[PDB]
Symmetry: D2
Subunit: 253 residues, 4 copies
């Protein structure tokens, strides 16, 4: 099943979509600069692009680390990105009360991995009718994603994306199970599946590339990143696009 | 470091405290009845006891499933338990705004494992000044518990309990690492460590298993245990025998 | 570092080599038939090929379970394969005393995963001077592979291939860490690394799975692929499967590191 | 099911048996000296004791690490340990042809974890009729131990001990699943189960150090009611006092 996000088609048999941007929204000028760079590079390569950032980082390394600009300013910055570049945007939500005001600006809203089984948040997100990105917790198997999907469906929303972020592997390490993509496709109605390569990785550039190419080889709707340096983005995306283009060009069976 | 909860001393070198009760609060009468049974059994064995229940089930089977009595009715039930039995109580909280009104009634407030890194909830719980039970997520190593402890300390609360619930082991399965208890004691200032044997097993009759696992964990020297046939009694008799032996040996 | 196996160049930046064949040697006719099919398919696709089979099942669930042809009969079958097709062959060895007579016939000899730390077998394999395929145990991390490599080097043999077969993941399940390939390459002198996709899946239709997993691994830039098929992928699907692996391998190998 | 090893009863309901000694046999005098220390400490505490060592250690971390005095001298040293102290002994075998001559002298023979599914070794060990200690591989679940047991039974030997060593847990680390003991007991006819605490720990890093760890882990395993404790290469006495306290408590109580 494909999902339309403005003029983008997102789907497991469609050209990959890049979801990228910054960690925490901290100012208008810096956000617009970064977004501009992603926009120019993805336009040059013909890669569909959705800008990502958090306005309210709920899990901070220390209490008093800056959470971001907050809801009211964060949504203004997202409106300005949409106005200036004409692209969709994505951001996470942490409380039921945030769902409506965030959904009425942001094209995709995201269920954080830690909150993925919090029924009240699922229902509130569902009721927006927006496109939803579900972050797979690292302790949840791919066959348990169906239960989360089922709850969204019960609440009346089937515009769901599944986002792989790796699985707990002993202490501290994560491993990405390349077979979990297919399990999620088979058990969840072939909803779009995207791969968060960044938060799957605890030099690092050779690693992120190897992992991103391996996951995209399995036929995915998109790639989700934060840890990549901005100027090397083009070389990186050239390689992902080469592989995606090859894979998607071949029939499934 | 010991923590006093009314007349109970909770600590890794003190007689173990049992934290037990029911999953979700459903009614006053059922709750009082269940509590009464725990109270009678723990009193006759001489085991300190804290009653546990949730007022709200945050992860439901269907969007349509009983959520439990809710905050307002849940707190009235807890007030009734405290009045009738004179024991401390423990419950979990899911949102920052709930922390203050819950902490007015409940002796121990509990940080759910899924929410253990949600900074706002941590701060709001810390600011109550109450005793806090931190549920260790199954994807977090024991050496990371110090980072949660550090946050509570910055927010001005050091009355923390660490609660082992098992570690992810492949898909849909847990294992308890018996060495994690000592790692948490060493790296977190010897705060009380308790063992949630029940959640540690939900992925695996089951009575032999819970006993084996509880005895094994309590052999490592812990502050507490978190969970016609008299099954609770027979179980606690054996835990207390081991706990008493282990606590009588020098460190 | 590349390794030459007759006319084949095996290396992490060379076109991938297929190591394939059957699980256990059962009959001479059935072996020649299966091999003939692998040979015809790989030749048409321009994929270098090494024929694989075991002459003995060492590890079966029952003491009476069928174990195969045995050493003496197995080596006569391997000689026949080499004579008829002119290709290299690969087989596993289980005891030190077998290494020399097996190495006299088989181009590549294979250290089973369960025996990978058995020092007497390592030393006897190393002393043959043959190319060795090391099966990475499922309990060994990729950074510990260097310790096995070090032992072969200590015993005077550096013609070593590292073969990924998946990692233990809870009870009775495996996961393939796509990053372990690059860890092996960096820590083991960039020796050829190959992927045994088949054993990596035996704990999990299955054709879609093997393809996804094989593609994902080969995306990381590997010297080869190691698999089984039965009359295990069905033998008839081999061509379509390899067409896809080769398309990806060719794309990946054409990009610079 | 209990197993008699001379005058020792090994069983999940019997006082625990200690299996310990040295890593590799090097010389008669040094072996006797070490064994004499284990013997004096275990006699003083009333703990049954089986001396362990390798004569040809086949899995050492270097190819030139000493494997031991070898089969002929190793067995002579074992005979002397038996004659001098009157205790049973245990050693590991890695090749089929070694099983018979080893079993002439060593009371218990041990199947290395890595070789546990190697059918030819299993059969050759079974055929000795001796007591066998099966080391559980770290990549094998406790419910797969029944398949190893079945093969020994098929080959005509039921005097089997199951030895826990931990399970793979991510890369490098091992974790001991305290529920695996009960699974092995339920599925394998309640054969004796012993715990190799040492192996279970060597992958683990660093007020306590490794001694506090080995003690915590040993006590946790013995709390599940086990036939014995198995150690690898004044502290032994203090350690055994604490294990014995717990073992005595646990074994004094009925199962159910
Ligand atoms: Cl994110
Ligand atoms: Cl193989
Ligand atoms: Na919207």
């Amino acid at each position: 099943m494909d999902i339309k996000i403005n003029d983008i088609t997102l789907g497991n048999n469609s050209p990959f979509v890049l979801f990228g941007g910054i960690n925490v929204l901290e100012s208008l000028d810096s956000t617009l600069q970064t977004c501009a760079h992603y926009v120019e590079v993805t336009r040059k390569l013909g890669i569909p692009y959705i800008f990502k950032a958090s306005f309210d980082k709920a899990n901070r390394s220390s209490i008093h680390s800056y959470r971001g600009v907050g809801l009211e300013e964060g949504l203004k910055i997202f409106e300005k990105v949409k106005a200036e570049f004409g692209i969709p945007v994505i951001t996470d939500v942490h409380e039921p009360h945030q769902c409506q005001p965030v959904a009425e600006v942001c094209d995709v809203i995201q269920l954080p991995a830690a909150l993925a089984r919090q029924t009240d948040l699922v229902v509130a997100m569902a009721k927006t009718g927006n496109v939803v990105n579900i972050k797979k917790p690292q302790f949840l198997s791919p066959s348990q994603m169906k239960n989360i999907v089922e709850k969204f469906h019960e609440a009346g929303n089937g515009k769901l994306i599944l986002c792989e972020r790796g699985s707990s592997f002993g202490y501290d390490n994560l491993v990405v199970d390349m077979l979990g993509f297919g399990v999620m496709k088979q058990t969840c109605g072939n909803l779009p599946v995207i791969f968060d390569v960044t938060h799957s990785l605890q030099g690092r550039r050779a690693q992120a590339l190897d992992l991103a190419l391996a996951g995209m080889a399995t036929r995915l709707a998109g790639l989700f990143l934060e840890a990549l340096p901005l100027h090397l983005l083009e070389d990186f995306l050239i390689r992902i696009k080469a592989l995606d283009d090859l894979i998607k060009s071949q029939p499934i069976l």
